[PDB]
Amino acid sequence: SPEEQKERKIMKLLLKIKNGTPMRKAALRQITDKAREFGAGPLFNQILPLLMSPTLEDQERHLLVKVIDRILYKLDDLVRPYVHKILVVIEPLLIDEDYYARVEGREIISNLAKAAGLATMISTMRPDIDNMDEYVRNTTARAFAVVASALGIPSLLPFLKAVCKSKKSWQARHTGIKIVQQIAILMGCAILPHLRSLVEIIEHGLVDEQQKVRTISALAIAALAEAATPYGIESFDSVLKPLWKGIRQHRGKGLAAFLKAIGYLIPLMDAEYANYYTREVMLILIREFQSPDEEMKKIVLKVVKQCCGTDGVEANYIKTEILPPFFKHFWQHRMALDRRNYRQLVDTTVELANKVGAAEIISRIVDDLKDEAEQYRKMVMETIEKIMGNLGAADIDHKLEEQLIDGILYAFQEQTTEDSVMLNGFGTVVNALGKRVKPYLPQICGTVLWRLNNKSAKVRQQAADLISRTAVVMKTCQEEKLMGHLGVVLYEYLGEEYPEVLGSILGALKAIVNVIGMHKMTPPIKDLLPRLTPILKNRHEKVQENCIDLVGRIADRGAEYVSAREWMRICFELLELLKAHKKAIRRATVNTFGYIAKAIGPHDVLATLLNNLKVQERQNRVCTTVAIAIVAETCSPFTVLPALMNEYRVPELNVQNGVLKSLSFLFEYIGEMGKDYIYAVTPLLEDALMDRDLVHRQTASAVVQHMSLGVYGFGCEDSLNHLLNYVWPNVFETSPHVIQAVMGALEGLRVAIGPCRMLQYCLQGLFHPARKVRDVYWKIYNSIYIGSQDALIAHYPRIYNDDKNTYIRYELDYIL
């Protein structure tokens, strides 16, 4: 049949779309163009089971949604007889947990709305306005909100005006107000031009006889206010008197919705009305403070967070009226056993301290730092952490300081679990106190040492982490003897078998060396570093990073007490770690190798590296190459280039390729520092660019590229022009890695010498008789043009007119 043929062709096309490579583009283009010929019938009849297939993958869903979009755009009024069925098929997608599923549902529905028009959408969706099932009404409300987003809010405004005032049933009014709420939630700040109209349309519902209509009206007001933040308060004038009166009558979840609406309305107001209104609602709020139902308590907590964050509500009012019942009724051990209440109360209390002052809030809870309930201790400690991280410790006096010290000491001592919150809290409080924790530092380090001697290694790891976090303040407090004792105990704990704790211990040792110094360190460096030498072959990345950083700092500021042979051994062990996958270990390795190279002479380590360069001919040769570059960047390059170039005179070729690769990476790595060494390496590059071996030409072109990009804008134009004369003749080379390196060199030279010189090299062969020459030169011209389109205007040659066309750019020939 022709319908069966249509079905088979559509099936083949969809198959080419889902599984094809291109093919997808062509098939997509043809199914939109042939949409009206196929008809909405077979198309949607086959698409809907595929769209709701349980085994479809996400990107396949995106592809099919794009197909739907294209076929919908050309098929406008032909989709109308099937809109209702499309709706019944699609609306479970609008409540799916996947966010992208809901976005694709809204996009499909909006495309459907714009293809079929507002009329058929209202005519289609009206019989379900008063349906008994709540979820069908919820789906229709979301669908109407997306339809409003598609066609514009004013287009759907009269329908809402009619539905929200329907005399026949409260269900229609409920659905219309829910439509308004979903419009707010979906469109955000875009609802602002019609916010007044929506509020005027729904405001009557607040005094309705049905409770659910009042609740959905308050929730819609809250959604409109949240979407309008921080604008549009004037548009709410007409809603102010109902809600404010409603909370003096309603109780329960209705009162909760009304207060939530009020709490979202207050931050939109100016100072005077915010003050007046929050004074008007604080009595009802404080009354609801002791409610047993948890959703009400969460909503009122959110509302107090909102209203205390509004300009106009003075700090003294919050001090005298809000703070005592809040702290008396909310800070109890029952609420700490649920995560949401925990987090919400913490953020609310931090915002309160943000407005009324840090000390005012901190002094009311420090003693609870010594409660036996460990979860309560964790909650109060987290609260103090966030408050003190925002504002500091400048507001805290001596008495509250001692209270804080005693509380954190007790909380840290009576610890049975490896809480990272206790570690971060201790660290940030001590580091925020600064030089003020000086009198309390003996007992504190005693407790750290206590936890450093705990039987379980995770507690030890936490103690070492605390040491690292607090070493700087302990230094500025001048207590170097306890720090030295801590270094001695950690050095005695360096044979620890568990890698993460050992890494934390090494980090603590790095902190202790950074604060005490290398001369007064206990144990001596001459005993410390050989103990660190076998730890470098450990496989865990944390131990590796920490130990490498420690060795690097030792080599940076205390290499006096260590012989050169031990440092060469460290360098030999360190060379292999330059090819690690983790960038932190590579960075630490670079830093540490640089510190060692700076500390010791260049000659011996450079000799070892050149020996390695010649005797490897394998993958770690590039490792050796990186090490040479590190030496050149950290130490001075005039200590490397003489010996490197004298080793180049050996005629074994493979060593020369190694020298060239080393120079390439060296110049790329040192960048701007190479500007004083172009002349020094110019003869070797002259030799290599004219050598018979083509690998030499490719690597030398790489050196030229890295050089030209590194010295860009520092006046090396003549040396690069000279090297350009040796780089250029290789543009006809056939080997891909070679011509690729040549083009890279040409691009670097375009940057460094300028597009005008490169264009001057280009113009003869752009219209050369040979097609191969034209291919090469037009490739180069394309690269120059893409990189330097606007500059070439000044560099094009004078092309004279002929008998047919004008080729002179006369404007540039103007002379005032």
């Binding site: 012989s563 050169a564 042979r565 010791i600 002479g601 260049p602 000659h603 011996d604 000799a607």
Partner: peptide, 21 residues
């Protein structure tokens, strides 16, 4: 060999780094 003069080379490098700074 080089191992006997390694300490002398390190001392010369330290002297050069002190004189350069």
């Amino acid at each position: 060999a080089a191992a006997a003069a390694r300490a002398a080379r390190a001392a010369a490098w330290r002297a050069e780094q002190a004189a350069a700074a």
